Amino acid sequence: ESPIGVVVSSRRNGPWAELTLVLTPQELDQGKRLLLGELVRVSSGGKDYVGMVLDGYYEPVGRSDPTYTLALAHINQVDLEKEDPWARKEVNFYHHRIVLLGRVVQGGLFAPSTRL
Amino acid sequence: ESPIGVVVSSRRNGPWAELTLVLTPQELDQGKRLLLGELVRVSSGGKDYVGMVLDGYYEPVGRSDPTYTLALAHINQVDLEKEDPWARKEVNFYHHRIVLLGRVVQGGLFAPSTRL
Amino acid sequence: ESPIGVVVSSRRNGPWAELTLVLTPQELDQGKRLLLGELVRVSSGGKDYVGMVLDGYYEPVGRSDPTYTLALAHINQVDLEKEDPWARKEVNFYHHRIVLLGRVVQGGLFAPSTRL
Amino acid sequence: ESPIGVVVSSRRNGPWAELTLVLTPQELDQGKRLLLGELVRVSSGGKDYVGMVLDGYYEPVGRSDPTYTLALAHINQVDLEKEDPWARKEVNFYHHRIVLLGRVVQGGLFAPSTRL
Amino acid sequence: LGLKDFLDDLRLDHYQDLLRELDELYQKLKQERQVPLHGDGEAYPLLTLTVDGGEGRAFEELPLLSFGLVRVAAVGVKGFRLPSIAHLLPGYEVLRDPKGYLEGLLERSEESPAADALKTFFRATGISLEDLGEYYTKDLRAFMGIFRDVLEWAYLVWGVEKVLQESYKDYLFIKDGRLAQLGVRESFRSKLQNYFARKHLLLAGVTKRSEGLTSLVMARLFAEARGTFVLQVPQELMEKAYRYERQWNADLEGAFVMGRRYVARLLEDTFRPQEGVAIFDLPPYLGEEDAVKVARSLRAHRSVLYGGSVGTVVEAHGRASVARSIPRRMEEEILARFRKAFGEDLAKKLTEWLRLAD
Amino acid sequence: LGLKDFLDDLRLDHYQDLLRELDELYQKLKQERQVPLHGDGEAYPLLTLTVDGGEGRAFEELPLLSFGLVRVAAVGVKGFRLPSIAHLLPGYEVLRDPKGYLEGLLERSEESPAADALKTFFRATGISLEDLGEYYTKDLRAFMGIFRDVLEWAYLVWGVEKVLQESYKDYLFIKDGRLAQLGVRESFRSKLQNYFARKHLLLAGVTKRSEGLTSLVMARLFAEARGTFVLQVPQELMEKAYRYERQWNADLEGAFVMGRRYVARLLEDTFRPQEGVAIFDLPPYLGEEDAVKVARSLRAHRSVLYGGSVGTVVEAHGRASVARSIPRRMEEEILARFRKAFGEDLAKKLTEWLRLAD
């Protein structure tokens, strides 16, 4: 009953609308994941849309160097989870792309895509 | 009776003229929106043009990191519309692209595109 | 019995999931190498996948200038294997790309690719 | 007998492996050059490979502005060889690309390309 | 742009005045004795100390709503090292009362390595807070530097007395910076110089660059001289350097080296005029043969990282460095720990104030 | 990276009284009259003065081989502006040994514009070279700032005396920075004040933000503030800011505003808490009505460039600014003039030094 992540961007790509979702360290630690091709609900302006998860990639958030951080931790035999919880909170993010398929109309016919 | 947004750029993209429009946090909070494919009036140099809304995308305005700000707000669990108005007021912009089709002249005739 | 390198990034590149592995100076000094086209095991979320080494390239790690460091060492006839441990340790990294093919399940049946 | 330059990068470029070589001001002043298409020996990890010189180009090394330096020296009527030995020492590098074709093994056999 | 405004009354006589002292100094240096370093000799392990730090946001102009971080670390040969010591200075508390925070810190001395090192440093050589003078209480800018310097000295003394009380005599102790202390009374320098004297500590201070004029002339000297070598800096040049630095910054008065200076060449070849040059200082109880030995050790631990370095210096500096992410994460931790003690009401207004002001 | 080495012994017991005192200041603000600042209103014209400075490469590391550029420029609304005074201070010259350079410049037989302005300022205001005290003779870092401040004051006085003999009677002179002079004696301030009162100058010093400004608590209380308005900063806020400045920086004995301080609002929508706020200081001989009129003029010249600027201030700052190509070409031109006024051997030796360092 709670949002999976946080929406950080939206755009119109070709004939479709896409938005970008970010999964945070706490949600990734809780075990919450999104499968590719999964159907999700998108709430916007009091309206519910059906969306599909299309993509997934790792990107740095903020002013950080995940490669250097992880390599240094591996070199110095530093177990992030148990020894440096703070260094593990700044690199544990993930990105997803979600396409808006349309809007379900109760007592009516499915409305494809969106202009808003 | 007032302009919807602010024009921030213009160019010739092929055989058509296009311009970029920005909607600010105040206008977005007032519920103002632009639908894709919608017809708008464009005032320039004392002349009126017909335009169509072609695209819409999110882009940072000024010196800001919307991803970091929104992710931090989500992590700390702060209602962004009730606890952090100033954080909400620096990320809530939106971009649109508008193409000029022509203008109406004399006895209802249409002058297509433009050289200006 | 132990992991080879450190994973620093992952994504989906078309129909296949891929990740990036980094071999550190100590591992490279111990003689640990990955052959192109070799099959490796990938452990994620307590599950085992089969992966293949696809690519390999050199990339600076951190805020270093490998070209300048190596040229300045070269013009002084400095053997980095014997005289400049710090300079060698700052530049001896290496990158690899690994694609996930699928996994073994139940009585050995193969599930191709992945959605996670 | 001594090595020609200094290797500063390597990677896999399609069906072949390639590396990047840099020639320094001292070697260039000694008159050492590499012909395009020439065959060279590559020593790596106790093994000998055959390589071919494919490319050559100029690139700044370190923190320098070769165009500004050379233009200013020309404007001020300065001879780099005589008046400024130090300005000629920071811009006189050259870059080459070398592709590894394979290695000679056992009783005069050839192992094509490489996986390391 | 209007450059012709600056060309109205150009004067070109001070340039001729300047191109006399530089030449005199060059001729003075050409009379020094160069001692070669034939890639061999007598070398013994290095133990290097370094101190770094950082400041949170708004500390530069709003220190009352920020803090500061200072961390000191050391590294030795054989994989040897020491535990690091880090401290956080609350900007608001310190800014309103210097010497009111230092004494409070010194009194706790329960577990904090900073307070333990300070007490050990004071009791190992009989240095009192009156010896620190009055420069460090004038304002926070002076207090931060004095705190860093005193903490590094305390770290060195504490490491000499508590971690290596028998195995200290076989190491060469390296300090990143000149063997000098500014902003303290002569008693501080005398007591340090006599505590090192009664222990015969093998201490050398390597400064690299800050120094500017000495490097300017030594680059010209090296351009001629061929081969790595070590030579002593003349007092005639030292006094001119001291005069110039004092005139450029009065607060540098009393920052004279507590010993003698030497310059050594570490790299045979370079791409820039001032690469591979190590300037170090030795206490007065170390002779010229000891200087030669220390130069051999430094050349044996040479590196080509930052255009010719000592390797151990860069390693220690990297270990003691503080990532920019640390000041930002410290605020997020401190605010949570403050809320979980003061309630969910008094914590909201702190965040509101922070949002309104930087 | 190494966190948790700072967490131990956080000592967060001061954020309580910090917020208590901040709330006290906010309460003091809440009882301040907010004179409306509607768009209309009789306003004066404007005449804005500004000063900028540039530095040649290696001025900090080697101030004995470089020099400094100072440019003072004034703009009258749009185009009724004064000339621009530009001066080059060679690093070696007499900057290393101040208190003689000023004499040589003032007694300039040529009387270049920089010296002429200082002559006029001194003679008109009655301020002698002994009012500057010995702070400017402390060292070059203090000398540069003191010289720039005195140059701006002299430019103002010279513009009032020799370029606007009577017109100044119907202008509002705007000087960037607070109406405060640091590093001089009380006699200097008294002379400036009495001259300004004698001429009934309309002078307001406009500032935005850093020195240490807790006075930007206006960031709060501008929310739900009903657009634009004018207000006077309370004495408690002024005293707290002054004490914080003198506890954070020192050398700030002279920082008190020579008159009153007012805060006005130029923009009602900002996107950010602290945009479009003007902070102007008025001389002791101006009433509260003068403050309202000055605020009306400031709003009439408002801009949206740097987050609610004053417009003429940004225009002036954009004219006296010095590009770096200016110092580069200055170095080259000085080298050429040295070559053509002395021997080519001498010029080549100087160039060799400049190549071997800075």
- On whether any CB of chain E is under 8 Å from the CB of C61, the answer is no
Answer whether A12 sits within 8 Å of B36, measured CB to CB. yes
Size of interface D-F (CB pairs under 8 A): 5
F1: closest CA of chain A, how far (Å):
7
Measured CA to CA, the distance from residue E89 to residue E108 in angstroms comes to 15
Contacts (Cβ under 8 Å, ≥6 apart) of F331: F56, F57
Closest CB to E92 among F5, F14, F356? F14
Q: Do chains D and C touch (3 or more CB pairs under 8 A)?
A: yes
Q: Does B90 touch chain F (CB under 8 A)?
A: yes
Those of residues 93-112 in A touching chain B at CB distance below 8 A are 93
Q: Is residue A37 within a helix (H) or strand (E), and if so which, with residue range?
A: none
Residues ≥6 apart with Cβ < 8 Å to F125? F157, F191, F192, F195
Angle F84-F88-F91 from CA coordinates, rounded to 5°: 155
Asked whether the beta carbons of residue E329 and residue A90 sit closer than 8 angstroms, the reply is yes
Q: How far apart are CA F105 and CA F254, in angstroms?
A: 26
CB nearest F273 (choices: B26, B62, B86): B86
Write out residues 294-353 of E within 8 Å (CB-CB) of C: 302-305, 307, 311, 314-315
Candidates C29, C59, C61, C67, partner chain D, best to mutate (most D CBs within 10 A):
C67
Tell me how far apart the alpha carbons of residues E261 and E255 are, in angstroms, rounded to a whole number: 14
Distance CA E234, CA E185 (A): 27
Cα separations (Å) of E349 from A89, B84, D6, E343? 26, 12, 60, 11
Taking CA E76 as the corner, what is the angle to CA E72 and CA E82, rounded to the nearest 5 degrees?
Answer: 45
F99: left (phi over 0), alpha (psi -120 to 50) or beta: left
Please name which of E214, E304, E310, E202 lies closest in space to residue E263, comparing C-alpha atoms: E214
Structure tokens at E34: 């160069």
Asked if A30 is an interface residue toward chain C (Cβ–Cβ < 8 A), one would say: no
Cβ pair A58:C9 closer than 8 A:
yes
Contacts of F273 in chain E (CB under 8 A): 355-357
CB proximity list for E124: less than 8 A, separation 6 or greater: E157, E158, E160, E161, E195
The CA-CA-CA angle for residues E202, E45, E86, to 5°, reads 80
Q: Which amino acid makes up residue E99? A: K
Instruction: From chain A, pick out residues whose CB is under 8 angstroms from the CB of C62.
Output: 65, 68
Name the strand (E) or helix (H) holding E9. Answer: none
Closest residue on chain E to C90 (Cα): E305
Binary contact (A115, B36; C-beta < 8 A): yes
Contact status of F269 with chain B (Cβ, < 8 Å): yes
Q: What technique was this entry resolved by?
A: cryo-EM
Q: Which residues contact B93 (CB under 8 A, 6 or more apart)?
A: B22, B23, B24, B25, B28, B58, B59, B60, B61
Q: How far apart are CA E175 and CA F224, in angstroms?
A: 57
Q: Cα–Cα distances in Å, from E320 out to A65, C7, C44, D73, E236?
A: 18, 26, 34, 43, 37
Kindly state the helix (H) or strand (E) to which residue B106 belongs, with its residue range: none
Main-chain dihedrals φ then ψ at residue F289, nearest 5 degrees: -65, -40
Residue with tokens 């000891």: E290
Cα–Cα distance for residue pair E19/E14, rounded to 1 Å:
9
Q: What is the arrangement of strands in the sheet containing E260-265, beginning at the earlier edge strand? A: E35-36, E229-232, E260-265, E277-282, E203-206, E172-176, E46-55, E67-76, E85-90
Compare CB distances from E269 to C69, C76, C85 and report the shortest one's residue.
Answer: C76
CA distance F177 to F209: 10
Sort out which chain A residues have CB atoms less than 8 A from E324's CB and list them.
63
User: Strands, E, within F91-177: which ranges?
Assistant: 172-176
What is the distance in angstroms between the Cα of A79 and the nearest Cα belonging to chain C? 12
Say how far apart CA E353 and CA E357 lie, in whole Å: 6
Give CA C15 to chain center in angstroms. Answer: 22
Tokens (6 digits) for F121: 């300022």
Burial (CB < 10 A; 0-12, 13-18, 19+), residue F123, is exposed
Q: Does A71 touch chain B (CB under 8 A)?
A: no
What sign does the dihedral F269-F273-F276-F277 (CA atoms) show? positive
Q: Is it the case that chain D and chain A have 3 or more CB pairs lying under 8 Å apart? A: no
For β-strands F46-55 and C6-13, DSSP reports them as: unpaired
Residue carrying the six token digits 């002054």: F242
Chains sharing 3 or more CB pairs under 8 A with chain A: B, C, E, F
When scoring A2, A8, A19 by the number of chain B Cβ atoms within 10 A, the one with the most, hence best to mutate, is A8
Instruction: Identify all chain E residues contacting C62, using CB atoms and an 8 Å cutoff.
Output: none
Q: At a CB cut-off of 8 Å and minimum separation 6, what does F170 contact?
A: F44, F45
Q: Please give the resolution of this entry in Å, rounded to 1 decimal.
A: 2.7
- CA E268 to chain F, closest CA, distance in angstroms equals 17
Q: Which of D8, D9, D55, D58 is nearest to D35 (CA)?
A: D55
Q: Which residue of B has its CA nearest to F269?
A: B26
Residues A78 and A96: their CA atoms lie apart, in Å, by: 29
CB contact under 8 A, D62 and C58: no
CB contacts of F6 in chain A (<8 Å) are none
| Yes or no, beta carbons of A10 and B57 under 8 Å apart | yes
Q: Which residue intervals of C8-116 are DSSP H helices?
A: 25-29, 66-74, 85-91
